[PDB]
UniProtKB/TrEMBL annotation, chains A, B:
Annotated residues for binding of glutathione 1: K20, Q55, V67, S80, Q81
Protein name, entry field: thioredoxin-disulfide reductase (NADPH)
Binding residues annotated for NAD(+), in chain numbering: G288, A289, S290, Y291, V292, A293, L294, E295, G387
Record's function text: Has a glutathione-disulfide oxidoreductase activity in the presence of NADPH and glutathione reductase. Reduces low molecular weight disulfides and proteins.
Length: 588, 588
């Protein structure tokens, strides 16, 4: 029980000291380590409730029962007298660098999860390597260390979203007394891209600095796991070599899909290319209906573009569909055109991209609606947002034994372990997990602590909150209304809802009953809050706090007894009273 | 136990039906009442814990044990046959309307708490009157129905705060690619005031419409309680009269104080006048250091004014003083000037207000610093924010016997009852309670349900969250750090903190290490979160959701195991890890 924990901790930890806070012999060892720049984990037996058992169980390893005890990669090294003997005899550094492997830990992938896992393992003395490589897009776009979010995801798209929100700030400003005239002001795309790319470049640099200051080896190379302990690397010069590591963490992420139609790869782009595009896209078609598709179409329209979205069936598949529809109704009322129930058949090139004068090309798009009618239109840019996928047959030889699911994602235990006992997987390629940056970071850090510091805490993947950053934002935590009804039945579900109007919108003459929120509850479990949903400004800031209360099991009575902050949008959640079953209107 | 709840409910409700959902004899009675336009409360016994004991207990009043039973103002009226006998003989209106008093409920004070209590009472059948009168300021300012928040408080000051935030939006837009030159844009005070006052006027009108559509008598008159059940009223022609009511609720609020010095009343103004001032203030001095003073000084500086604040001792007395100092340092770095440890001695008039050409006067302010050094400077406008007080001598005859404290506030039990048994107090005049608008609204709604619908729920006044809307906003829920250290001792307190930078501030070249947040936790109680503090944009939307978690007993591990929403400011709370005791820097 406890004995199985100590055996697992001693075997994978790299350098670990078993100690007591009260002991001066322990402190003198801590002082020698280091002094010699030796990083190590530390376990304070007098802090754990069953420290007395662990102390006794240590003897099965060292034949002794006192503290301090210092281990290196599963082997007992000695007590106080024995460590100092190794110190003053110049023997200690060679002991702590003894390893059957090149590294204690190899991370494949330099993104949100990989960077987090690597930095955390180094903090407990694990000798660590982080591999990262960015395969170019079809037109050759490439970027720096840090992953999809930092370079071509959350970070550049929220910045561009903010550029879009600022257009309504300029409008709202006249109503509040500022002299400017919004209709005489325009937007410069390349100025915005330059500022976004400057910030991304400082994140690239900061990560290389952080790996250096933690003694992590960074290799800009493509990794391939060929046996449980061997990683084959190909570098910037196509030179090939093999390195070994004790533990492996796969964290390679995904890349955008293209539909299998003529002209797609040749003449269109994806979001990988959009955030550093040297020219404004101009008249744009977005193909898809994911949050990537709706967020990108949304800010392009706000920046003055002529934007159309082509929707195969529904918006935001997998999210609450009433919320999805309200999100789309708002974008359509503020400029974004929709071609509903429609798929593309081919893209035809009329103008090549004008790389000299810095202008987009011109394309002809042909498709069809679900009733057979035809679609034909010209656009300057075609953006595909039709999902994302890993390509683990490029990271992972089939002979190693890592089981994959139907979609090509790694099947893992609830401690991130794959079917091969020393190989783990985190982030987007972990099958069945929410694909989100804060999830990948938490999974990476907690895994690093279990591998190298004897921690036990697991990552909790339930009820992770989300926010879709459309022109009007949409934040959520928990089940959709239709999922709650499907799971418990309509008679056990109660939904409280209300419209609302931000106070900032009054003087600026904006819509009265467009913002909206609801709580979906379970009658038979004390009116437990099963899902929360809000459409409105700053929806992410609104939603985050409530996710702690949902984690804790919050009910409708808990919301009722909490008092609101006034004047805020978020306070509407503390006074909700109209139910859907009542049939009373939710307008205010 | 159950006995005396039923007694209290029946003696107090105006029209109450004890019913069952399954019974069609009640459904026949309910429809008779809806058709006759008789509002009433309804106690469904088949949906209560011990509904079978009340059924028995009801016979102490009716001599029958069956359902339905209908009561009017304490008196049993009949079963299903006896009520339809009154409906067929058309004796029913006269019975439901007969009362010992003119009204079941008189509300003195038509503001946040008073309007809320009156409307909720009228739902359940109570014959309700709501009195409101706005005594003019010394220079004669006056406004309409709705109270301090609506007319001269939360609503107009956050609207003016938003006009100030938009100035930095115009600045930020350049860096995001928009083509405006912020240097060449100015602000028009009177344009702002017109927009703000038009919204307030639509809220005055909305309240009068709401009162009428609930059959609430609204009297624009000054009320004085002369006896426990008698209220003397004086209308706009100084016509005196007397009405009577069963229950009385006092909700008359407070007004600003003036310091006892020459010139202040004559030549200065307060917040009561600021929000409808017809001229721009020009060069302004604010005297005080509360949230009113800092909030007003904040947006006046952002609108281009020349603003000085005169501080006796400290900023934001009663709030966490590390947070208060960070607030004031931000204001000082963005154009607010402070005269520290200084008080005023007199205000001298140099120019009279040019009420024709719409211009302020000119004033000479004389005062001294705390060491003894003298202060003397000219300003166009002087605003006093040195606190607010009630004046119940205007409202309340000392012979009625309602106990006040040494401040003049009403001493109440935990269910809002005064020392006279039919008289209650709510809102700012309730002694020791937080003086906030959502608190008044909840207090008054919950009391109305206890008086007239047999509810038992009390208002919870603990851990109510706040937000100070200074140029950088400051939200808080729970104890300040000094208050926790004092109550539990410095060794039982751990504090997690961190600076942060909003993503939106990166491209706009704003400051790196100014926003800040902290969790104040108790070690010996599972690291319970005693207080949450955040300085940054949108701080009210950030804090609100966490108030629910804090109401539920959240610990640091509850925050840890919740996943962030990326990219937001609020997510920084889910990964805090630097303690104050460790001495590591909180910078980014
Ligand atoms: C447009 C867009 C917007 C998004 N917005 C948000 C948002 O607002 N919030 C949010 O939470 N999530 C958002 N996401 C999702 C978020 O980016 C991902 O969930 C997250 O980045 C996944 O992290 P990861 O570590 O699993 O993979 P990644 O961050 O993709 O890192 C994997 C890295 O490994 C590299 N690599 C691949 N193969 C190899 C190899 N063989 N050898 C070496 N290196 C290799 C890849 O090139 C990449 O650099 C967005 C995604 C997109 C596309
Ligand atoms: C500048 C300022 C800013 C504020 N900002 C906020 C904020 O952002 N958030 C927040 O939560 N709170 C804020 N407050 C506090 C909030 O306004 C009060 O807590 C709230 O208005 C209290 O409501 P009330 O019903 O107790 O009294 P009031 O709202 O003051 O209503 C009492 C009413 O009764 C009238 N009256 C008085 N005497 C009589 C009489 N004899 N007969 C008839 N009528 C009478 C008064 O004129 C008034 O209309 C602010 C206050 C100020 C001054
Ligand atoms: C006694 C108070 N009374 C006065 N009195 C004056 C102007 O002396 N003006 C009023 C206006 C509305 C309601 C009541 C009013």
């Amino acid at each position: 029980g406890t004995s199985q924990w100590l055996r697992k901790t001693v075997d994978s930890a790299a350098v670990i000291l078993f100690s007591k806070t009260t002991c001066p012999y322990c402190k003198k060892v801590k002082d020698v380590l280091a002094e010699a720049k030796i990083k190590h984990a530390t376990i304070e037996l007098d802090q754990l409730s069953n420290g007395s058992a662990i102390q006794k169980c240590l003897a099965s390893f060292s034949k002794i029962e006192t503290v301090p005890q210092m281990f290196v990669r599963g082997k007992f090294i000695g007590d106080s007298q024995t460590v100092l003997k190794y110190y003053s005899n110049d023997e200690l550094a060679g002991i702590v660098n003894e390893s059957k492997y090149d590294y204690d830990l190899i991370v494949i992938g330099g993104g949100s999860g990989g960077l987090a896992a690597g930095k955390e393992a180094a903090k407990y003395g694990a000798k660590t390597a982080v591999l990262d490589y960015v395969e170019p897009t079809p037109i050759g776009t490439t970027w720096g260390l840090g992953g999809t979010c930092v370079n071509v995801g959350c970070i550049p798209k929220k910045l561009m979203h903010q550029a879009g929100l600022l257009s309504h700030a300029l409008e709202d400003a006249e109503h509040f007394g500022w002299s400017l005239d919004r209709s005489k002001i325009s937007h410069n795309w390349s100025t915005m891209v330059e500022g976004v790319q400057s910030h991304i470049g400082s994140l690239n640099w900061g990560y290389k600095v952080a790996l250096r200051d933690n003694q992590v080896t960074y290799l800009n190379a493509k990794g391939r796991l060929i046996s449980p302990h061997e990683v084959q690397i190909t570098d910037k010069n196509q030179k090939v070599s093999t390195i070994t590591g004790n533990k492996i963490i796969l964290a390679t992420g995904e890349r955008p899909k293209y539909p299998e139609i003529p002209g797609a790869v040749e003449y269109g782009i994806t979001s990988d290319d959009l955030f550093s595009l040297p020219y404004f896209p101009g008249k744009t078609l977005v193909i898809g209906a994911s949050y990537v598709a709706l967020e990108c179409a949304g800010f392009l329209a706000s920046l003055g573009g002529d934007v159309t979205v082509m929707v195969r069936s529904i918006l935001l598949r997998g999210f609450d569909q009433q919320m999805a529809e309200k999100v789309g109704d708002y974008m359509e009322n503020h400029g974004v055109k929709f071609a509903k129930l429609c798929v593309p058949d081919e893209i035809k090139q009329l103008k090549v991209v004008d790389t000299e004068n810095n202008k987009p090309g011109l394309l002809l798009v042909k498709g069809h609606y679900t009733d057979g009618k035809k679609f034909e239109e010209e656009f300057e840019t075609v953006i595909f947002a039709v999902g994302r996928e890993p390509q683990l047959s490029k990271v992972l030889c089939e002979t190693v034994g890592v089981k994959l699911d139907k979609n090509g994602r790694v099947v893992c235990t609830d401690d991130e372990q794959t079917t091969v006992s020393n190989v783990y997987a985190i982030g987007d390629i972990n099958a069945g997990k929410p694909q989100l940056t804060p999830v990948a970071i938490q999974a990476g850090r907690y895994l690093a602590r279990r591998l190298f510091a004897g921690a036990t805490e697991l990552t909790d993947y339930s009820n992770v909150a989300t926010t879709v950053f459309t022109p009007l934002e949409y934040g959520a935590c928990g089940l959709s209304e239709e999922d709650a009804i499907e799971k418990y039945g309509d008679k056990d579900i109660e939904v409280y809802h209300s419209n609302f109007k931000p106070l900032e919108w009054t003087v600026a003459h904006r819509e009265d009953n467009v913002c909206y929120m609801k709580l979906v509850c379970r009658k038979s479990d004390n009116m437990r809050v099963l899902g929360l949903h809000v459409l409105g400004p700053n929806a992410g800031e609104i939603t985050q706090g409530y996710a702690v209360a949902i984690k804790m099991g919050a009910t409708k009575a808990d919301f009722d007894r909490t008092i609101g902050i006034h004047p805020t949008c978020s306070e509407t959640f503390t006074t909700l009273h109209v139910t859907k079953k009542s049939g009373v209107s939710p307008i205010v």
